[PDB]
């Protein structure tokens with residue numbers, strides 16, 4: 001099945017998921033001089049104070065922190081969005097080396113990792129319906145650079161030993177995702193897709209301009225996870241990122257001058 005290796009990686013995905021060559025695929029390179037400021041874009045509204053985290057899962061491609069999305073608890077509104085989008089899960093993509101790991105790039109620059117806070121449009125009733133709609137999902141993307149530690153990330157880092165291999169999960173209640181946000185909410189936005197199979201073209205991407213900084217030790221602990229299941233040959237979970245895809249007939253808009 002699909003993955004990130006030489007024989008099942010991003011260049012192979014189109015054989016099972018032909019939309020991989022579609023008209024609104026993600027990620028993309030963000031050319032900062034070509035993005036256009038849109039003064040009609042509204043400020044993002046990130047309302048995470050009532051968030052209810054449940055569990056953390058190694059799914060064989062990344063690790064997901066899952067939330068209770070059966071009521072309006074942690075929601076994203078405003079910006080380019082119409083309506084209310086509920087937080088379902090967050091996860092990361094990261095590299096084997098500090099100079100790679102992000103999916104989006106900025107003037108061709110790669111960051112060490114990228115956080116994806118995944119939300120779905122409540123007008124579609126459930127997440128499975130939302131992925132079938134062109135405005136079904138909103139993913140808030142946040143770049144990570146290596147520098148000082150991010151204190152709000154450490155509780156995630158410290159549970160990773162309990163979910164080393166594919167299929168392992170652990171309780172993960174009372175986690176506050178506000179501790180993963182940078183100071184500024186300035187953003188770029190464009191219509192795109194899921195960056196893993198099934199690659200559905202259902203995402204309004206909102207990518208923050210300001211990265212967060214994490215320590216060497218924090219990212220090193222990401223790199224100790226395994227793609228494989230327990231008792232299978234060990235393959236380190238690193239370089240789980242899709243490279244930039246053609247922009248095609250799309251304009252990236254900026255919320256800031």
Ligand SMILES: CC(C)NC[C@@H](O)COc1ccc(C(=O)NCCc2ccc(S(N)(=O)=O)cc2)cc1
Nearest residue numbers: 067068069070088126127128129131194197198200
């Ligand atoms: C349990 C509550 C609290 N939260 C979890 C909830 O948000 C997940 O909701 C879902 C998730 C999946 C479905 C569903 O219909 N699955 C069958 C079709 C289906 C399969 C795979 C995907 S994927 N790989 O893009 O995410 C999406 C839909 C329907 C609802």
Ligand SMILES: CC(C)NC[C@@H](O)COc1ccc(C(=O)NCCc2ccc(S(N)(=O)=O)cc2)cc1
Nearest residue numbers: 064088089116118127139193194195196197198203
């Ligand atoms: C009917 C069954 C099969 N569904 C129940 C059970 O399998 C769980 O269902 C699901 C299915 C999927 C999810 C879920 O989180 N899917 C994420 C799909 C997804 C989301 C975001 C990205 S990215 N890199 O663009 O941000 C990529 C893939 C959550 C629950």
Ligand SMILES: [Zn+2]
Nearest residue numbers: 091093116195
């Ligand atoms: Zn992702």
